[PDB]
Amino acid sequence: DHAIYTAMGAASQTLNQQAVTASNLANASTPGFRAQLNALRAVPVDGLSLATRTLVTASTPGADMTPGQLDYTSRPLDVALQQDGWLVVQAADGAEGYTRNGNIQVGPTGQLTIQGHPVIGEGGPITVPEGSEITIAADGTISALNPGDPPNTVAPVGRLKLVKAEGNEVQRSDDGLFRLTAEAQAERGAVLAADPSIRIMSGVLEGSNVKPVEAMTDMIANARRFEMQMKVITSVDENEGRANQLLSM
Amino acid sequence: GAQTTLPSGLQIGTGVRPVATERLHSQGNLSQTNNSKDVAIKGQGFFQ
């Protein structure tokens, strides 16, 4: 009777994968989005006597960390990072986080925020001279020019905190901001040091890395798997219906 | 879970949402209209 559950599980987890895939495709135009990878893992039931039942469960082993195609928008605050680089922004709960969205905005009082998260430099959050033509160099040096004054000024202000961390060492949080894993936190400390070897380009915005070929193949496979599990469920139900007459003496 | 093997878990997303639509305040080109009442701003400023 329980073979109608095994297949059911697969069907249910199929829907889960579909959700993940949709969550990727809804973010096809999101800047600095890292598509979540999905993977079914098989769990066997341990016990007597004949191990025949093996269920599935979906999981998301992190994200896909191949940098996307760059968007050339003529805005000096827009930045694109070298492969395996992260900007450090203060998250909601007063803690550090890593993001790839390089669309930096200037607040009314001069605070640099990405998506409302105040960016953190070498000395903490950055305070920009209210109203200034910000120019970011190739390594994160910020130069501010005040309107009206001469151009022999372009005095530097600070430097962004760019972090090197591969995709294996980082896990996503529920707010969409990436953080270090527990093992990586133990092995590389809590707060990562800024790597001066990371190159940052100003005037370009990085898009998402949602591959449409993979999404289409995943949808086709999910649909076929769902139909197979529904057929198995129907077969099991019909068999039990036929079998439940024996009890008639 | 507790860790050669892939990480377990399942963090489903929720979808997309537009947060803010921005206008690029870069100075545009100048078009010549001989009438004496049109003027063009050379830089960062607005008429009140």
């Binding site: 769990v43 016990g47 | 879970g1 507790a2």
Partner: peptide
């Protein structure tokens, strides 16, 4: 021994972990 026999001992609990402990 054979599936469907009679024994004086309850079967062990049927645990199926998702990850190796």
């Amino acid at each position: 021994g054979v599936p469907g026999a009679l024994s004086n001992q309850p079967a062990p609990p049927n645990e199926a972990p998702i990850a190796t402990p």
